[PDB]
Amino acid sequence: QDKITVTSEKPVAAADVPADAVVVGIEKMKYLTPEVTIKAGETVYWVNGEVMPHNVAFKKGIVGEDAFRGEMMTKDQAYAITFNEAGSYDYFCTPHPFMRGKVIVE
Ligand SMILES: [Cu+2]
């Protein structure tokens, strides 16, 4: 089905993120780590630092045949995606498509 596994449909509190996680922070309309590289099976967390809501989304054909739109995080919410397959995955923020980043899975 999908190259990815979503954990929780819902955003979790940043207080729920584990200490050893790879975390991509979001501040000032930017993903703070624009290119992160993990191994298949690892989970990436995004944590929104600001009051502007931000999500993580994938166009069609990137993590599956369909498009994927994560739920919106408000301030200090976090969001997790587990990447099962090796590859390069671009995401963007649905209401702010100039916000982009990528995950390299190997
Ligand atoms: Cu955004």
Tell me how the structure was determined.
Answer: X-ray
Q: Residue 72 annotated as binding?
A: no
Give the number of domains in the chain.
1
- Ligand 1 midpoint to CA 31 (Å): 9
Q: Is 73 annotated as a binding residue?
A: no
Resolution given for this structure, in angstroms: 2.2
Q: How far is the CA of 50 from the centre of ligand 1 (A)?
A: 10
Render the chain in DSSP notation, one character per residue. Answer: --SEE-S-SSPEEGGGS-TT-EEEEEETTEESSSEEEE-TT-EEEEEE-SSS-B--EE-TTTSSSS-EEPPPB-TTEEEEEEE-S-EEEEEEETTEEEEEEEEEE-
Query: How far apart are alpha carbons 31 and 13 in whole angstroms?
Result: 18
Please tell me whether 29 is known to bind a ligand. Answer: no
The answer on whether 99 is annotated among ligand-binding residues is yes
Here the CATH number for the domain that contains residue 9 is 2.60.40.420
Q: Which domain holds residue 18?
A: 1-106
